[PDB]
Ligand binder design. Structure first.
Ligand SMILES: [Zn+2]
Ligand SMILES: [Zn+2]
Lengths: 80, 579
């Protein structure tokens, strides 16, 4: 299901609403931002695992449907 | 120049909110600088400069929209090509969205030589670029130039539009697909057959369901550009695959645009291919599709082959339907219940009676109001098909049970039909077990309902005559002015308010005007503040005689009641009747 690990409080985290969060979704975005300072090029689902790069790679809208998918992938990936 | 050291201070401007009010008016600045100055240092500035916030950029690219003239006209328009090719590459879409909008716009303002000269080159620059954005922003620039270049350029564009449909980044492939639509329209058959189609296919089968999806969307327009002969050979295999597609989202596409395809395809391919498909859609695993299918039912049947219609419907469609009525999803049910009554002037009296009433009836009783609702709305019809007597020995019952439906809408629904219904059934019939029904509503928990019920009488009278009113309605109404519940006595004064409109002078004056004046002495001030309003209402109907005789008299005494509201109205009456 949806661990408070992948994403705490849905609607929000997905759009920087929860403060000082510690969910991958939140954290992974940060990598994204951070990572985008030293670089100018646009980030893409391959190189980034952030929730948004994901959505854009498969052109999926912001909804729990898409949140679940993203998780399955972040899961298969974190587990070998 | 002049404002080339003035606008700069206006830009570097400490705050950002004014750089909006600056670019927004970057046309009165092109007016200022000559068409030789606007393009002299004004455009070469807005280029290697301006890095502001995305909204400022939106402003710039928008403004660079209307400009084809403020720098010359179709002779120089190609001087706007470099400042966009920059905007159409920013990462925030909203921005490059516009830019490409402008690009496309001023494209028309080019010259055949102008296009193959600078435009088309930029189209290869964007499409070849590193950043997927650019290639995406490119996709929307082929449909415009191509139509007006050389058969050699066309040879390139197409070639280019192809590498896009296969781009590594789905973003772009989706882009190209979302653009396979129009770009196919500007091509000439030969191509569209030996190019669009192939692209249309690959794309309809791309790895990403989010793209095959965008492919199918294209289908209709494509098929709308090929004579029947070929469709069986080009569109069908694909379209066929679509209906089956792994992604419900795609099947949904097919489902939703099903009618459109019908008219796109042809009338025979329809039963040869679509009809079988339609059946599986209606049987589809994902409700969101079953539903999207059910809506298409009626129209699909209507636009079937003038002949085989009755056949296919009964042999193919009809059975699925009967299964849909019992669907689990409150929606599919609901959807279908809306369009299902439409299969009558299409099927037939008997057929309908044997095959559809049970359906309708099944629905008339559904636990869902959106359904009960949807079925009630189309009844007025079927009564045309099956006999009026048939209606009364099958549905009349449900309908009555419906009139005491839990939900006010459903009730309301029954009420607005009643007038039409009675009409058809005949006055004598109504008089029996319909009258009573129409009167109960005058006491429904919900106002909207009572109000409607009241109008219903008026309507009912109009359909049955004041004589009828007089011996069937008027009574029960006046009698209701006895009920201890003060609210009801009001309802009574209201009916009078309504009926008077259609019962004519001689009847208002001897059966209502009285009861109205009498209640003007009700222990409950409300009944009385209304009784005035009423004598005001049923005023003009009366005759100057009866008025000043009983109206004005026992209306004056009213201006002397306690409760201000009573007064407020009591005299307001006298202020219209001239007293
Ligand atoms: Zn979070
Ligand atoms: Zn990312």
């Amino acid at each position: 299901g949806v661990d408070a690990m992948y994403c705490k409080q849905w609607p929000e985290c997905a759009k920087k609403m929860s403060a000082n969060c510690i969910c991958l979704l939140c954290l992974l975005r940060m990598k994204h931002e951070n990572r985008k300072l030293y670089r100018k090029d646009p980030l893409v689902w391959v190189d980034c695992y952030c929730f948004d790069c994901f959505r854009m790679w498969f052109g999926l809208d912001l909804c729990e449907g898409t949140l679940l998918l993203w998780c399955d992938i972040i899961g298969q990936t974190t587990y070998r | 120049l002049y404002p080339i050291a003035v606008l700069i201070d206006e830009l570097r401007n400490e705050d950002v909110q004014l750089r909006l009010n600056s670019i927004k008016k970057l046309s009165t600045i092109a007016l200022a600088l000559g068409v030789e100055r606007t393009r002299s240092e004004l455009l070469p500035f807005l280029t290697d400069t301006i890095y502001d916030e995305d909204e400022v950029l939106l402003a710039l690219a928008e403004q660079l929209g209307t400009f084809t003239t403020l720098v010359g006209g179709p002779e120089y328009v190609h001087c706007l090509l470099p400042p966009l090719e920059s905007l159409a590459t920013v990462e925030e879409t909203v921005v490059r969205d516009k830019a490409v909008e402008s690009l496309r716009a001023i494209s028309h303002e080019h010259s055949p030589s102008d296009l193959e000269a600078h435009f088309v080159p930029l189209v290869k620059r964007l499409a070849g670029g590193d950043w997927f954005t650019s290639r995406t922003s490119a996709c929307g620039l082929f449909s415009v130039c191509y139509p007006r270049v050389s058969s050699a350029v066309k040879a390139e564009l197409r070639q280019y539009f192809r590498n896009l449909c296969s781009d590594d980044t789905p973003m772009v492939r989706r882009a190209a697909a979302s653009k396979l639509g129009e770009f196919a329209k500007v091509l000439e058959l030969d191509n569209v057959k030996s190019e669009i189609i192939p692209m249309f296919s690959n794309l309809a089968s791309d790895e990403q369901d989010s793209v095959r999806l965008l492919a199918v969307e294209a289908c209709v327009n494509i098929a709308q550009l090929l004579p029947q002969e070929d469709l069986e050979a080009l569109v069908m295999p694909t379209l066929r695959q679509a209906a089956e597609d792994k992604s419900w989202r795609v099947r949904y596409m097919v489902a939703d645009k099903f009618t459109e395809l019908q008219k796109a395809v042809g009338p025979e391919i329809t039963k040869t291919d679509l009809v079988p498909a339609f059946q599986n859609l209606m049987k589809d695993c994902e409700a969101e599709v079953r539903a999207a299918a059910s809506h298409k039912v009626k129209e699909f049947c209507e636009n079937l082959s003038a002949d085989c219609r009755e056949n296919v419907i009964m042999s193919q469609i009809l059975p699925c339907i009967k299964e849909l009525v019992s669907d689990a999803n409150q929606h599919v049910k609901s959807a279908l219940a809306s369009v299902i009554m439409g299969l009558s002037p299409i099927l037939g009296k008997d057929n309908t009676i044997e095959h559809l009433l049970p359906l309708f009836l099944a629905q008339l009783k559904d636990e869902c109001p959106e359904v009960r609702l949807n079925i009630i709305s189309n009844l007025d019809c079927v009564n045309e098909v099956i006999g009026i007597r048939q209606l009364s020995q099958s549905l009349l019952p449900a309908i009555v049970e419906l009139a005491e439906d839990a939900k006010w809408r459903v009730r309301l629904a029954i009420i607005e039909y009643m007038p039409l219904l009675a009409g058809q059934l005949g006055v004598e019939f109504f008089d029996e077990k319909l009258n009573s029904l129409c009167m109960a509503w005058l006491v429904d928990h919900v106002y909207a309902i009572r109000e409607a019920a009241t109008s219903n009488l008026k309507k009912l009278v109009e359909k049955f005559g004041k004589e009828w009113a007089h011996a069937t309605i008027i009574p029960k109404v006046l009698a209701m002015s006895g009920d201890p519940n003060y609210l009801h006595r009001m309802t009574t004064l209201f009916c009078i308010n309504v009926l008077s409109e259609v019962c004519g002078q001689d009847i208002t004056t001897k059966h209502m005007l009285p009861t109205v004046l009498r209640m003007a002495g009700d222990p409950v001030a409300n009944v009385r503040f209304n009784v005035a309003k009423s004598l005001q209402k049923i005023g003009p109907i009366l005759d100057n005689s009866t008025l000043q005789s009983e109206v004005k008299p026992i209306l004056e005494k009213l201006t002397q009641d306690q409760d201000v509201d009573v007064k407020y109205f009591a005299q307001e009456a006298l202020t219209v009747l001239s007293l």
